[PDB]
Design a protein around this nucleic acid. Structure first.
Lengths: 400, 59, 134
RNA sequence: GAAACUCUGAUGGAGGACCGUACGGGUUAUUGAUGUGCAAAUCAUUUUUCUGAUGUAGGUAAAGGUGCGAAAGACUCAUCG
RNA sequence: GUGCCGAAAUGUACUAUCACUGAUACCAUAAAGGGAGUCCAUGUAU
RNA sequence: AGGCAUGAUAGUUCAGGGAAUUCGGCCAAUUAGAGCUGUAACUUCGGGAUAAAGCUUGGCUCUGAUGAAAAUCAGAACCGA
RNA sequence: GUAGCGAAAUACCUCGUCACUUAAUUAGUGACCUGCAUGAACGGAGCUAUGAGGUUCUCACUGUCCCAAACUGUCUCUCAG
RNA sequence: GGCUUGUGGCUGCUAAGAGAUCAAAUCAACGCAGCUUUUUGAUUCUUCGAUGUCGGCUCUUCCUAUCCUAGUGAUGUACAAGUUGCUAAGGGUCGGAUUGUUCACCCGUAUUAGGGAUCGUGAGCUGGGUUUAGACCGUCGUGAGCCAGGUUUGUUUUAUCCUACUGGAUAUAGCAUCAUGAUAGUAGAUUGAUUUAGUACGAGAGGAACUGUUGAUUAUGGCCUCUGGUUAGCGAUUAUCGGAAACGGUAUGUCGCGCAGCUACGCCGUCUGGGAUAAUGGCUGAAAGCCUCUUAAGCCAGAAGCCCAUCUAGAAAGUGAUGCACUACGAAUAAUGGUAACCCAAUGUAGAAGACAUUGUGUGAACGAAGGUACUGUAAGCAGUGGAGUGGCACCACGACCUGUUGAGGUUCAGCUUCGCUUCUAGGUUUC
């Protein structure tokens, strides 16, 4: 043909434009269609990406070559602290789209939520936001608005934010009433909370306003949203790399070595007519920091965090904590966690929003037996010889 | 767990590498550091950091 | 034809015109590999054998009876490292293969040196005569 | 060794011999850099020659349908059928 | 030339047309050859 | 004075394969000094020839030979990545 | 048109015909000769030595390539002039 | 390039027969009618104060006259492999040997089509060919010279301008968070083995299929746990210089190993159902008292194609929720001041500049400590019935190196983790 040879297209056309996303967390596009009936049951939940190990699973697949054999599998580990419900929204259906019918708020609001409505907290003397404390306006107002949500709004979503949690300053010894208290940050830094909104897929609408009002001003944990064996979609922003050449960005073949003005380029931008560069053509620009979803990530185990028996499995009868000895770029993980199979989008420290998958697998890998023999807790700097500190003294008890 | 050929340390599953020798030796290794010092026909009795050193060197 | 099974996607070490040793006593000192059997087209990509790949070869150095002919090999040891799903990473000291007929019966009597696991696990006749499997 | 002479080792230092230096003489390749040059012919790495038919300085001879040319229509003050 | 863009009757009277189709000289292309699609129709027999 | 992504240019290094790249091994890589072996077809008998192909080379403590000579050559221990 | 040479740095037809070379050769080498248009100081046949000369293959070695990647020096980026 | 289509390519109409018998399963003469601009002609309209001329390399998009994949009908269709018609351009269409080649021709593989975009693509490359000046051969010419006859050596310039495209910012009708989602793009596609099965079918030879399971190739998005590549952190070492050693310089030093970071040769995801259609197959049923998928009304089944679902961007679609701040039925139409932001100061979750993100009295930064963690591989100095030996006094000199102190010493966030009041934290301008 005219091309002179046939070879697939370089790079996907559906993930344009390849530019930066300014979202700090995974913005959810579309929630699963409500089954209707059943129970409302929350869907999405935020977890921070803590790090990564591998695990030695023992496999049970009938009619395959790995029947009753061991299989090493990489595992990301998202830390998930239990997050706090605050608000509640309706959404009326209209000809234009879904449009909102007012948010109700809780009785008080924690000052982690007040951070969101300032860029300069440290300057602010008044710090007056959410002054819904006045008794006459707030109490009367909610029962008016909660009536309007029964009338109009079909879809109902629950506003909720991450617990930054509280502490005592420096050398004051903690657990004492005279001491002034203050917000501890995350493993990142931040005290300002990640507010989301979470669709409740429970039938009747009216039924939802029992559940979403029962859940209001109470912390949610992970164990009553997801369950072990669930396929989960991980939504987040990927890993920023700045500007990039045409060769590395789109994965093209670089030119001959003999080229004047260098070879790290696509040679023909285009033909004479049309007299114009096309959108389709590969080109120099941003790489990474792209918002992405990824489908069908299994969760192997769910955590809790003095016994510290979470790291260890049924076998061995030795208790090992999940954090690898020495902790890189993160923190210990003294919270609920999720051993997700394989990769998850974004760097360490990033807020990933999890989500239940939109439609169901029929693949047998989806409904497999999980059974972990044994997990790595060696250090990542760089080659790790000892799984635990306990091993150390026994292996080399006398030092200096 | 596998004990190494060179060095004589323990290491756990999903680490290191194996070089199957001629005359059918299955020799596991700790790292590239241990593999590379084996590849140049060096003794573990002379190299200090190893564990097979420290048996015959009396500690 | 005499595979009974399939591969598990190893690292491929042996692109076209990789001359390798022959384990068998048939009389092939070397085997200049031409193409891998069961390989699809792609622009500028050299087709590359790993272990347990039915390959097309010429014996270059050997007996005058065998050489200057096209024949079916099979790869046994790879030298380049690859990851088993178990987690272990394995390579050999040398590249080596053996010649087979169109039926999938082994032409030579017995193997010199070791063989890989998935070569034996796939091909039965190479497993049926080998000094050690790894 | 009958002889005519011819075997081994040293001595010797011949050759338009060979390898190889330079602020020497040339200018092969990268068809590299530069090509709004440092430069109206350069730079880097590589390459050729290096006691000779060698290089080079000053003085001196040959002048335009002429000069000179180990000859390319080469050169004759960035100018040459 | 007269639905609107666009000034001027989607004029009055009378016949055809269903097709991812047709639509104003020079002019911006289409033929030989087919069709119980529909309307109009020539000669005979029952 | 401050940054360090991309790209140009000059450089080290790259698993497995080893010219499949390309008009073309262009480029770069390998080889290399010295001592002791050992050197083919062909030849105008002068060459080829550093043909090719092997080995050894450090440090330290000594011993011996040749000179006038404070130098240079040969040999042996012991030492470690 | 003698001797040599002969699809040649000359052979259009032509990717001539038959071997060797390769897994595969319009290339390379050796034969045959209906030499479009070979040929003897218009010099013919020859290649020991020499060649920054032209061309084919084998061994060694390699980012030329499968298939790219990382790091380093000076610029490209920002500011003052 | 345009017009034209002889020539080249592609397709109709007709049948005179091939095809055992039988024109129309499949070929198709003698004729006749068209289409095409992917061949080459013909012409001289444009360009001679110059549109850089062949092929290859690299990347994009488009056409269908479909080879494969999706779905269907015919048959000289038993099976399988075939021949052939229709709808379909979403995806796929290749590694090499010689040749400058386009083309051709062989070896090999996952079965295997052809084209366009100034014969796409030279301020993107290459310069092998073609086409200068040097030179050789052969025929021709008295000669200078000639030759789609052959051979060899022969300079490939400029973007900093305007658009186009790629990413990133800034002005407006407050400040901030959380949302809606018009519109634009869209992604998965192929295939082996196994089960059904040596079964249906067939005299035998042979030899299927829907569905399920399980791998792979290729493309795509993401990741660094392992593995491999790279690496001024440690150690070793050549020549020389600092009186020796120590610890260093220089040769942008050489070798060995090497966290972090990036990266692939590594690792994970690619699920999944609608709606209306194209071909085509059906139902009921007239026209045509029979019969017909509609060539009529009505109804059903129906493609990898189109539109949705999913995923990427997104209110100059100048929008919205929440916080603070200043005048009337309906249906048919063969009917009823003071806030706030930004500067500034760090940090990194990120970066060319802008921006984005987080904090700014708090372990935030700087330092320090960890039987926290790494990398290197046993510091110096001292001691030794250690040590091939040589030299001297009546056991001391010089001695690569080895044993002990010593898994020591050095380095360890700069983009690593834990906790510690040791030390330090200030100002400036607009906005409604």
């Amino acid at each position: 043909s005219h091309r002179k040879f046939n070879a697939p297209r370089r790079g996907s056309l559906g993930f344009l434009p390849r530019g930066r996303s300014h979202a700090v967390r995974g913005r959810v596009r579309s929630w699963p269609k409500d089954d209707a009936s059943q129970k409302p049951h929350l869907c999405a939940f935020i977890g921070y990406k803590a790090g990564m190990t591998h695990v030695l699973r023992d496999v049970v697949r009938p009619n395959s070559r790995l029947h009753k054999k061991e299989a090493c599998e990489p595992v990301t580990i998202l830390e998930t602290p239990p997050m706090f419900v605050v608000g509640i929204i309706g959404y009326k259906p209209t000809v234009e789209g879904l449009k909102p019918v007012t948010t109700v708020w809780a009785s008080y609001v924690n000052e982690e939520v007040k951070r969101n409505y300032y860029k300069n907290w440290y300057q602010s003397k008044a710090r007056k936001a959410f002054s819904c404390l006045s008794n006459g306006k707030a109490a009367e107002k909610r029962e008016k608005q909660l009536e309007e949500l029964q009338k109009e709004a079909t879809v109902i979503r629950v506003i909720a934010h991450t617990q930054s949690a509280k502490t005592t300053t420096r050398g004051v010894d903690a657990n004492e009433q005279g001491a002034k208290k203050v917000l501890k940050g995350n493993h990142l830094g931040q005290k300002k909370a990640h507010m989301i909104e979470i669709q409740i897929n429970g039938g009747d609408v009216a039924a939802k306003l029992n559940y979403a009002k029962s859940i209001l001003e109470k912390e949610i944990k992970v164990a009553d949203v997801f369950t072990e064996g669930e396929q989960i979609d991980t939504i987040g922003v990927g890993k920023g790399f700045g500007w990039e050449g045409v060769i590395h960005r789109y994965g093209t073949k670089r030119l001959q070595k003999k080229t004047h003005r260098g070879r790290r380029k696509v040679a023909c931008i285009g033909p004479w007519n049309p007299a114009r560069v096309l959108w389709s053509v590969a080109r120099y620009g941003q790489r990474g920091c792209h918002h992405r979803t990824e489908m069908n990530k299994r969760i192997y185990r769910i955590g809790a965090a003095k016994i510290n028996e979470g790291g260890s499995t049924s076998f061995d009868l030795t208790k090992k904590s999940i954090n690898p000895m020495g902790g890189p770029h993160y923190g210990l993980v003294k919270d609920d966690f999720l051993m997700i199979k394989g990769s998850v989008v974004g760097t360490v420290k990033r807020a990933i929003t999890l989500r239940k998958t939109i439609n169901i697998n029929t693949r047998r890998i989806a409904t497999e037996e999980i059974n972990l023999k044994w997990i790595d807790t060696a250090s990542k700097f760089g080659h790790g010889r000892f799984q635990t500190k306990e091993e150390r003294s026994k292996f080399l008890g006398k030092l200096k | 767990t596998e004990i190494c050929g060179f060095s004589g340390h323990i290491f756990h599953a999903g680490h290191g590498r194996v070089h199957i020798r001629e005359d059918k030796h299955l020799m596991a290794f700790e790292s590239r550091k241990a593999f590379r010092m084996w590849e140049r026909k060096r003794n573990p009795r002379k190299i200090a950091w190893t564990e097979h050193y420290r048996h015959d060197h009396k500690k | 034809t005499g595979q009974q099974g399939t591969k598990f996607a190893m690292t491929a070490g042996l692109p076209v015109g990789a001359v390798i040793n022959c384990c068998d006593n048939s009389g092939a000192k070397n085997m200049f590999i031409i193409s891998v059997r069961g390989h699809k087209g792609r622009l500028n990509r050299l087709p590359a054998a790993s272990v347990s790949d039915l390959i097309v070869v010429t014996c270059k150095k050997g007996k005058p009876a065998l050489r200057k002919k096209v024949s079916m090999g099979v790869v046994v040891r790879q030298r380049a490292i690859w990851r088993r799903k178990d987690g272990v990473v394995i390579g050999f000291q040398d590249n080596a293969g053996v010649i087979i007929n169109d039926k999938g019966e082994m032409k030579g009597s017995a193997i010199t040196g070791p063989v890989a696991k998935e070569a034996a696990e796939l091909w039965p006749k190479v497993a049926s005569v080998a000094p050690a499997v790894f």
